[PDB]
């Protein structure tokens, strides 16, 4: 759906918390604070 | 073997990339789609093809 720019792609899988495209969300979490990006 | 009935035409298969059933792909087939801008297509559009 475009690009993301400011959050780092992690190679785990959790819930949805902010939907971004198809089958990306992203979520704020301990691992320092920092926005990632997953599936 | 489920009692004798043959659920090997709506189960996946994992020879296709994607794990959908044999009815499944004649009905992602048969449905015709317009290929809208949900797939990335502004280097399709920018290049004069
Ligand atoms: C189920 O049907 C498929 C074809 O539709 C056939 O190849 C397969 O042998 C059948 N299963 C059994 C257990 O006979």
Same mark, same amino acid.
């Given at each position: 759906?475009? /690009? ?11 819930? /949805? ?23 | ?49």
């Amino acid at each position: 759906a475009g /690009c993301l720019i400011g959050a780092e792609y992690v190679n785990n899988s959790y819930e /949805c918390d902010i939907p971004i495209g198809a089958g990306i969300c992203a979520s704020y979490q301990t691992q320092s604070q920092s926005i990632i990006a997953y599936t | 073997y489920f009692g004798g009935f043959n659920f090997s035409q709506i189960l996946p298969d994992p020879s296709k990339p994607s794990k959908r059933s044999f009815i499944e792909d004649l009905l992602f087939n048969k449905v015709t789609l317009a290929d809208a801008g949900f797939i990335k297509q502004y280097g399709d559009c920018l290049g004069d093809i």
